[PDB]
């Protein structure tokens, strides 16, 4: 996942503070992954988790990814001193706050759905839990 | 990168209730962020000076923020 355009190529780091206020409830499916701590979730990790969910359920069901990695992060070349201009973008990041719902899942069977979401959670650099649409 | 221009020190110089003399500069600005009211002239570079002694008074004049001076 990569945005097609960005208005600003190099940006400040997104701020890691506060509880999430939007997208904190399951809205598209029956089961979801809710974040319990701040972190920078990468498109690599997102694709890893999506593939884990799909290969566990193997068929049927629908998976929603309601975050997008559009905030870029830069990096200087390897062996360089400090301060000769900002580096070029090299990561794409979603800014995740506690309470945010990361993935959503619909599937008939409780146990398989929960196992698939646990598969996904073990790929993310966050403590997360599984929640349901009541 | 690396260039910038000088800070131009714009903004409001006399706030509501202040007693001014004729010729006081009230607002340095670009464009009419504020508009001149009674006893207030604008100025060549949108400066909103005072035409008379009195107290500065801010208000609304159907969408425009205006500065006036009460005798």
């Amino acid at each position: 996942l990569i945005p097609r355009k960005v208005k600003h190529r190099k940006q400040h780091h997104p701020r890691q503070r506060g509880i999430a206020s939007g997208g904190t409830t399951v809205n598209f499916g029956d089961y979801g992954i809710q974040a319990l701590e701040h972190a920078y979730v990468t498109n690599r990790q997102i694709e890893s988790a999506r593939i884990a969910i799909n290969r566990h359920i193997k068929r049927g069901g629908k998976v929603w990814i309601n975050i997008f990695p559009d905030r870029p992060l830069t990096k200087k070349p390897a062996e360089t001193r400090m301060g000769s201009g900002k580096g070029s973008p090299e990561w794409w990041v979603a800014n995740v706050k506690p309470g945010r719902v990361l993935f959503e899942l619909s599937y008939p069977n409780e146990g398989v759905a929960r196992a698939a979401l646990t598969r996904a959670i073990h790929k993310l650099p966050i403590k997360a839990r599984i929640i349901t649409r009541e | 990168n690396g260039r910038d221009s000088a800070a131009q020190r714009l903004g409001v110089k006399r706030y509501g209730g202040q007693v001014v003399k004729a010729g006081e500069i009230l607002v340095r600005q670009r464009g009419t962020k504020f508009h001149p009211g009674v006893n207030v002239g604008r100025g060549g570079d949108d400066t909103l000076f005072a035409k008379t002694a009195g107290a500065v008074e801010f208000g609304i004049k159907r969408g425009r923020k205006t500065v006036s001076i009460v005798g």
Binding site: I19, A20, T24, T25, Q34, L36, P98, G99, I131 | -
Partner: protein, 95 residues
């Protein structure tokens, strides 16, 4: 049907609401066509049980310290993390 005993809040604010929620109350407000809102503490666990048993469309027939007046639930402010009810909006109903 859904009986619930409530009281009128003494003080209203941020610290007051925190004290009530730690004492196990639900700070809530009851307005409607009566043109005047009451500030209340609903009991926490009892109201939660009433709500879970029959859903949000329940007609909360509640009594104030002296008077009785059945009410309805308008909306609930759910905290994201602890997933608990922080505040409840109630509207009066005339049968």
């Amino acid at each position: 049907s859904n009986q619930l005993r409530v009281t009128v809040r003494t003080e209203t604010g941020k610290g007051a609401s925190r004290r009530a929620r730690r004492a196990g109350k639900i700070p809530a407000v009851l307005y409607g066509h009566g043109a005047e809102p009451q500030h209340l503490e609903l009991p926490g666990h009892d109201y939660a049980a009433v709500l879970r048993h029959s859903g949000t469309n329940a007609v909360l027939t509640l009594d104030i310290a002296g008077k009785e007046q059945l009410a309805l639930t308008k909306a609930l402010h759910i905290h994201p993390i602890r997933r608990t009810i922080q505040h409840a909006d109630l509207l009066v109903v005339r049968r």
